[PDB]
Amino acid sequence: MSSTQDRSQLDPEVERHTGVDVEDVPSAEWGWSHMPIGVMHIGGLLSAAFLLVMMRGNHVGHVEDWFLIGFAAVIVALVGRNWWLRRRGWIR
Amino acid sequence: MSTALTHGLIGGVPLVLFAVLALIFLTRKGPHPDTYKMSDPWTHAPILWAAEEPREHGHGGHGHDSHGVVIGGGASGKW
Amino acid sequence: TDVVLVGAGIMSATLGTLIKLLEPNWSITMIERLDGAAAESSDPWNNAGTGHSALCELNYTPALPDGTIDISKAVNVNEQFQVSRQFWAHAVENGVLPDVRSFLNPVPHVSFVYGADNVQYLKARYNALVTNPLFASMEFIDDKDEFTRRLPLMAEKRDFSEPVALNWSQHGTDVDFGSLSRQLIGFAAGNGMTTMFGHDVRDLSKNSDGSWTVKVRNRRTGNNFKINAKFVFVGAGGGALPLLQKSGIPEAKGFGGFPVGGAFLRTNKQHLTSRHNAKVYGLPPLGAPPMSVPHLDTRVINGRQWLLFGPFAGWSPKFLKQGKVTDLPLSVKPNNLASMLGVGLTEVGLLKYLIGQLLLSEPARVETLREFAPSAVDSDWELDIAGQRVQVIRRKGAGGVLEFGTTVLAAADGSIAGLLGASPGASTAVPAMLDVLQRCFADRYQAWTPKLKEMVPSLGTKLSDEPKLFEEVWSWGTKVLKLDV
Amino acid sequence: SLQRSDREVLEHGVETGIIKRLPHGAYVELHQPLGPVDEHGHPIPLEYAGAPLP
Amino acid sequence: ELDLPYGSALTSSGRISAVTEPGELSVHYPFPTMDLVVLDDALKYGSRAAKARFAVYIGPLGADTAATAREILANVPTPENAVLLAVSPDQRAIEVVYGADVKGRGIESAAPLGVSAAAASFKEGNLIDGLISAVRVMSAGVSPA
Amino acid sequence: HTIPQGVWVAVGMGLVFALLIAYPFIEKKVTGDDAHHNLLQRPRDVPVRTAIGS
Ligand SMILES: CC(C)=CCC/C(C)=C/CC/C(C)=C/CC/C(C)=C/CC/C(C)=C\CC/C(C)=C/CC/C(C)=C/CC/C(C)=C/CC/C(C)=C/CC1=C(C)C(=O)c2ccccc2C1=O
Ligand SMILES: CC(C)=CCC/C(C)=C/CC/C(C)=C/CC/C(C)=C/CC/C(C)=C\CC/C(C)=C/CC/C(C)=C/CC/C(C)=C/CC/C(C)=C/CC1=C(C)C(=O)c2ccccc2C1=O
Ligand SMILES: CCCCCCCCCCCCCCCC(=O)O[C@H](COC(=O)CCCCCCC[C@@H](C)CCCCCCCCC)COP(=O)(O)O[C@H]1[C@H](O)[C@H](O)[C@H](O)[C@@H](O)[C@@H]1O
Ligand SMILES: CCCCCCCC/C=C\CCCCCCCC(=O)OC[C@H](COP(=O)(O)OCCN)OC(=O)CCCCCCCCCCCCCCC
Ligand SMILES: CCCCCCCC/C=C\CCCCCCCC(=O)OC[C@H](COP(=O)(O)OCCN)OC(=O)CCCCCCCCCCCCCCC
C-alpha cells in the first residue's frame, strides 16, 4: 500500500513494428530487444571456424585439437539446428 | 582374442539389436488417430480452435460480462 | 483448365475478371505462391497507389531543346488510366467491385517545384497541358497564401524568398491496388475460378498439342503435381522473368532482370495527415531514373489516412519481397550475360544514384523530406520497405539497356503471355490486359469487341480527340466511382 | 525472464502466504494487488512504467 | 447432466476430474501432431500481426450455415475482435465471420481470398493445409487495430 | 620480414578501445534511436544491450 504507481513517457525513435513483439519480449518498446538471427548464426559459424583454426598451431598436443573439434562441432550443430528449425517454421 | 573381432562385436551387436527392436516396436501403429480423409464423413465432435493470441483485459473470469456477439461481416464457400 | 493465371496481383486479377466476363464457361485456375491475394507488388505498402493519370508526374513532360514541353507521354498515360477507370465503373454497376471506397479515393494530384527556372518550366508545362481536354481543369499556383492554404504541412517553415509553384489537379485519385485485386479475385472466384494460395509454379513446358504443362508445388506439403492449360498468363511480379525463361519461348530469350527495391517514409500522425491532402510530386534530381521522383502522398489504407514519402531506392538480389537471395544469380544465363554486363557500362549514372540512395541514413531520408515539408521531425516518420521490382534488361547492340516501362511479352502463337517491368503498371492494368487479350486471342477478340465496348465505351478511340465522349465517360465514371463525394 | 517476472507481478500482485479456500481444498497464494482492484477479486493489470516493482 | 461415460467426476469445485484408459489419448484429434502444431503456430503468431483472435471450427455447421457460424463465433472468447473460419466437410461448406472491432482492417477484402485458399486446398484434399493457408492469408490481409 | 604475435594483441587492444569509445554511435546506428534520452532504462528492459555487456 505504501507504493505509488509510476507514469513514464520515454522518448522513442526502427520503430519496432518489425522484428520482435511485446508478446515475445515484454519490454520491446523500452530498449534494444532484437538481434537479427543472421548475426547470431554467422557469429556461431565464425566461432566454430576460429576453434577449428586454432588447431593449426605450435602445440605437439592432440587432446587440444580434439577439444577444439568437439566444441566447434557442437557449435555448428546448434547453429544448424536453429537455422533448420527456423527454415521449417520451428518444427521438430 | 581377435582384437578386431571383439571390437566389431561390441560395436555391432548393440546396433543390430537396436535395429531389430526398432523394426519390432517403432513400426507399430501408434495411439494417434489416423488423419481424417475428406471423403470419409466427419465423425469427430465439433472442434472449435482459438488463438489465445491477444491480451484479454484481466485473467479473472468475473467482470467480463457478455457485451454481445457484435458480428462484423461474413463469407461463404463450397470447396 | 482453359486458363492458368500465375500470381494473385492486380494484373492476374484484372485479366481473370475480363476473361470471366467475356467467357463465363471457361475454367480458370489462379496459382499464388503466398497464402493470400495481393500480398506482394499490389499490397498498398509495396506501391505508391497514385492512380497514375499523368497529372503530377513531371518526368512525362520533358522540356525540348526549343523550350517547348512534350506532353505525348502524359496524354497516352492519362488515356490508359481513363480505360482502367471505365472498366472499374462498369465493374461497380455490375457488382464485380461492391466496395468502391476500400480501393479508390478522391485525392488531388499536384506537381511541386521551387526555384525560378523550375517555376518557369512548371508554367510552360501548365500552358502545354491545359490545351488538351484531359488536363483542362489543371490550375497553376505561384501565390504563397494559396500554396499555404492548400498544403499547410509543406508551407510550414518554408522560405518563400525562393519562388515555389504548383500544378494542381483537383480530380486525382488514391488507389489501394490490394483491395482492388482482392475484390476482382473475389468476383472471379465466386463465379467458379479456382484459387490456389500457397502454391508455387516451378516450371512451364509446352505440350505437343500446343497446351502448357504447369508444374506446381504445394509449399505446405511439399507435394508436386501438374496442371494442363490451353493459355498461361505469368503475372508473378519479379517472379515472371524466371518462369518465362523456363517456358523456352523465343520471345523471352536474352531478357535479363535488374532487381530494384524501394522504401518509403510513412506516418499516420493526425497533426501531419490533417495538414496534407494531396499526392505531391517533385522534380527528379539530376540523373535520377524516371521512377525515383520524390513524392509526398496522401494514402487511404484500410480506411485510415497516411502520408508516404519516397521512394528511396533499395537493392536486394531477390526478385520478390518474399523471394530468394539466389533469384538474381540464377537469372544469369549464357544468352543474357552480355546484356547484364553491358548495363553496368551503359547505366553508370543509375548505378551511382542507387549506391548513393543505399548509403542514406534514416535522418538523411527525413532531410530529403524537408525539401517538401521543412517542419518535418525525424521521430514522426518510420521507414517501410516497399515492393521489389525487376527492371527489364534488353539487348541493344553489343550491350544492354534498362527498360523502365511495362512490357507485355506474348508467344507468337498466343498460348502464353507474361508481364515484365515497373510503371505505370498497376494504373494501366486494364489496357495492358486488353493488349494481352488482343494478341493472345486474336481469333476471339473481334467477337468480344461489343462486350469490351460495354465495359470501356472509349475502346479504340483517343479521348484527347473526342472531348464530348471524354466528358460523357468522365461524368458517368465520376458518379459511379463516387469520386464527387 | 526478469521482464516476464515484472509483468507477472504487475498483472497478479505481489506474492504472499498460501491459504486454503473454505468450501474446497483449493490453494491460493493470496496475492496483494499493486493497483486498483476489479469488482471481483482479480485486479486490473497495470502497465509497465520502466521502474522496479516490489 | 451426465459426466463422461466412465471415470470422470464432478469435483468439489466446478472442475471435472476426468480420466482416460492407460493406453489411449485424450485429444483424439484426427490430424497429425505436426500439422496440428503448424496450425497452432499459424493461429498463434502468424495472426499476432492481425491482433484479432483467429479461430477455426472444423465441426459441422448445419441448417443456416451463416447463422450457425455467427453463434459459434459468439462462442469464441473475445468475439469483439475475432475472425472465425468454419469448415463443414459433411456439407462441403466454408463460412467466415468477423467481430465488430475487426472492420475496415482489410478483413473484408481478405475474406474471399481466405475462403478461396481454403476451398482450393480442400478440393485438393487437405483440410488442415487449407485451414493453415486460409489463416495465413487472412492474417496477412488483416491489419492490427 | 616477420610479423610477430605481438601485433595480434596490439590490434586486439586497438579494436577493444575503438569499440568501447564508439559504442554509443554504433548502438545508435544499429537500433536507430537518436531521441534525447534523459530517463535511464533498466538493464532487463534492454535485453540485447545487457546481453552484449554481459
Ligand atoms: C564491459 C562492458 C560493460 C562492455 C560493453 C560492450 C562494449 C562497448 C565492449 C567494447 C570492447 C570489447 C571488445 C570488450 C570485451 C572485453 C573487454 C570488456 C575489454 C576491456 C576491459 C576493460 C578496460 C574494462 C571492462 C570493465 C568491467 C565492466 C568489468 C566488470 C566489473 C563489474 C561491474 C563487476 C561487478 C561489480 C562487483 C560487486 C564486483 C566484486 C565482485 C567480484 C570479485 C567480481 C569478479 C572479479 C572481477 C570483475 C575482476 O575484475 C577481477 C580482477 C582481478 C582478480 C579477480 C577479479 C574478480 O574476481
Ligand atoms: C562506426 C561508428 C558509428 C563510429 C563512431 C565515430 C566515432 C569514433 C566518434 C568518436 C570520435 C573520437 C573518438 C574522437 C577523439 C576524442 C579525443 C582523442 C579527444 C582528445 C582527448 C584529450 C583531451 C587528450 C588525449 C587523451 C588520449 C591519449 C586519448 C586516446 C586514448 C587511446 C585510444 C589510447 C590507445 C593507446 C594505444 C594502445 C595505442 C596503440 C599504439 C601501440 C600499439 C603502442 C604500443 C604499446 C604500448 C606503448 C604499451 O604501453 C602497451 C601496454 C600493454 C599492452 C600493449 C601495449 C602496446 O602495444
Ligand atoms: C573462466 C573459466 C570458464 C571457461 C569457459 C569455457 C568452457 C570451455 C572449456 C574448454 C576446456 C578445454 C580443455 C582442454 C585443454 C587442453 O587442451 O589441455 C588438456 C587438458 O585436458 C583437460 O584436463 C581438460 C579439462 C577441461 C575442464 C574445463 C573446466 C571448466 C571450468 C574452468 C569451469 C568453471 C569456471 C569457474 C568460473 C569462476 C567465476 C569467477 C567469477 C591436455 O593437457 P596436458 O596436461 O598437457 O595432457 C597431456 C596428455 O595429453 C598427454 O597424452 C600425456 O602424455 C601428458 O603429457 C599429459 O600431461
Ligand atoms: C565423448 C568422447 C569420448 C572419448 C574418450 C577417449 C578417452 C581416452 C583418452 C586418453 C587415454 C590415456 C592415453 C594418454 C595418451 C594419448 C593416447 C595416444 O597415444 O594416442 C595416439 C595419438 C597421440 O599420440 P601420443 O603418443 O600421446 O603423443 C602425442 C604427441 N607426442 O593421438 C591420437 O591420434 C588418438 C587420440 C587420443 C586421445 C584424444 C582425446 C581428446 C578429446 C576428445 C574429444 C573432446 C570433445 C569435447 C566436446 C565439447
Ligand atoms: C564482446 C563482444 C564484442 C563487442 C561488442 C560491442 C560492439 C557493438 C555490438 C554489436 C554490433 C552488432 C549489432 C547487430 C547488427 C545488426 C545487423 C543487421 O542485420 O541490421 C539490422 C539493423 C536493425 O534494423 P531494423 O530496422 O531494426 O530491422 C530489423 C531486421 N531484423 O539494421 C541497422 O540499422 C544497422 C545495420 C548496420 C549495423 C552495423 C553495426 C556495426 C558497425 C561496425 C562496428 C564493428 C562491429 C563489431 C561487432 C562485434
Side-chain angles (χ1 to χ4, degrees), chain A, chain B, chain C residues 7-9 13 16 24 36-39 44 48-49 51 54 62-63 65 67 74 89 91 95 98 106 108 115-116 124 128 133 136 152 155 163 165 172 178 186 188-190 192 198 210 222 229 235-240 242 248 250 252 254 256-257 259 261-263 278 282 284-285 287-290 294 303 310-311 313-314 317 323 329 334 338 342 344 349 356 363-364 373-374 376 386-387 397-400 405 410-412 414 417-418 421-422 424-426 429 431-432 442 447 450 457 460 467 477, chain D, chain E, chain F:
Chain A
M1 186 176 177
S2 67
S3 85
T4 186
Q5 301 84 10
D6 293 319
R7 298 295 87 198
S8 298
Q9 272 85 8
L10 82 158
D11 308 341
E13 178 157 5
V14 76
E15 207 260 326
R16 185 46 55 213
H17 74 92
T18 293
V20 73
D21 38 328
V22 300
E23 277 68 14
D24 182 67
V25 176
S27 290
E29 288 86 21
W30 289 86
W32 193 14
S33 282
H34 170 67
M35 181 66 79
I37 191 68
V39 171
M40 291 181 282
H41 283 173
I42 295 162
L45 282 178
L46 293 186
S47 306
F50 182 73
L51 286 175
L52 285 165
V53 165
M54 283 197 286
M55 291 185 323
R56 187 263 183 276
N58 65 350
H59 53 263
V60 65
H62 62 283
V63 312
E64 305 82 356
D65 296 28
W66 279 110
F67 263 99
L68 293 167
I69 288 165
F71 270 98
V74 300
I75 287 166
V76 166
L78 283 174
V79 167
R81 166 165 209 284
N82 193 243
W83 165 87
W84 185 239
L85 262 54
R86 301 173 101 78
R87 171 175 142 152
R88 294 177 45 194
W90 292 291
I91 305 292
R92 282 219 288 108
Chain B
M1 63 190 181
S2 300
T3 308
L5 188 150
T6 57
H7 280 114
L9 210 67
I10 63 178
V13 166
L15 271 286
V16 169
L17 177 57
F18 187 101
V20 169
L21 279 179
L23 290 174
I24 291 183
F25 284 114
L26 268 47
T27 72
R28 306 181 150 179
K29 182 66 175 67
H32 199 41
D34 58 354
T35 317
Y36 159 86
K37 299 291 101 176
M38 297 298 252
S39 62
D40 294 332
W42 177 253
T43 48
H44 194 214
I47 288 162
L48 177 67
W49 283 328
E52 312 191 351
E53 144 180 349
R55 185 84 277 166
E56 305 79 349
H57 186 46
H59 285 100
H62 304 266
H64 279 145
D65 302 330
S66 297
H67 294 124
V69 187
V70 288
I71 296 298
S76 197
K78 282 290 191 321
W79 295 22
Chain D
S1 49
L2 291 170
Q3 298 170 357
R4 223 154 283 281
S5 173
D6 280 8
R7 267 50 167 197
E8 97 191 19
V9 166
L10 285 167
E11 72 184 2
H12 292 306
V14 189
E15 299 92 344
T16 55
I18 285 89
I19 182 178
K20 186 150 61 204
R21 288 265 277 273
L22 265 288
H24 40 97
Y27 293 101
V28 302
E29 202 161 10
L30 191 66
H31 302 254
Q32 195 274 331
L34 293 178
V37 68
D38 189 14
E39 286 97 29
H40 80 300
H42 209 261
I44 299 100
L46 299 87
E47 57 275 16
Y48 186 60
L53 298 154
Chain E
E1 171 51 32
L2 180 65
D3 286 287
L4 277 294
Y6 197 51
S8 195
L10 184 67
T11 42
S12 310
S13 175
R15 191 184 64 83
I16 292 165
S17 178
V19 312
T20 193
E21 301 259 13
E24 306 79 335
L25 318 178
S26 313
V27 301
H28 294 324
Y29 288 156
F31 306 105
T33 178
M34 287 296 103
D35 86 349
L36 283 163
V37 161
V38 172
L39 178 57
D40 184 311
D41 289 349
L43 268 72
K44 189 258 283 182
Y45 68 81
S47 154
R48 262 183 203 168
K51 295 293 187 292
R53 186 177 317 290
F54 269 85
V56 175
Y57 172 90
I58 294 162
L61 86 177
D64 47 357
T65 60
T68 176
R70 302 310 182 279
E71 55 242 21
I72 62 187
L73 168 57
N75 215 350
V76 176
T78 66
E80 285 79 2
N81 59 347
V83 180
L84 184 147
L85 166 66
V87 189
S88 57
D90 277 359
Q91 313 176 254
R92 294 175 65 89
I94 295 96
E95 299 277 274
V96 197
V97 197
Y98 323 93
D101 287 334
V102 167
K103 293 291 291 185
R105 285 151 80 180
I107 184 69
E108 297 296 327
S109 60
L113 276 72
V115 171
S116 306
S121 287
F122 301 162
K123 63 167 70 68
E124 287 182 355
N126 304 309
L127 185 62
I128 198 72
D129 288 329
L131 291 170
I132 278 105
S133 294
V135 165
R136 262 81 163 277
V137 171
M138 298 172 150
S139 311
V142 174
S143 180
Chain F
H1 293 301
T2 299
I3 293 167
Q5 183 259 318
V7 314
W8 275 109
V9 59
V11 169
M13 287 174 66
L15 260 293
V16 171
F17 298 147
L19 297 161
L20 191 90
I21 292 158
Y23 185 77
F25 316 105
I26 286 158
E27 171 141 313
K28 90 173 63 255
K29 187 265 285 179
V30 171
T31 69
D33 269 72
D34 331 310
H36 187 117
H37 288 105
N38 275 305
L39 287 176
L40 297 166
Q41 50 201 54
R42 299 168 82 205
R44 79 185 59 195
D45 283 335
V46 57
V48 172
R49 189 169 71 213
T50 186
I52 287 155
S54 300

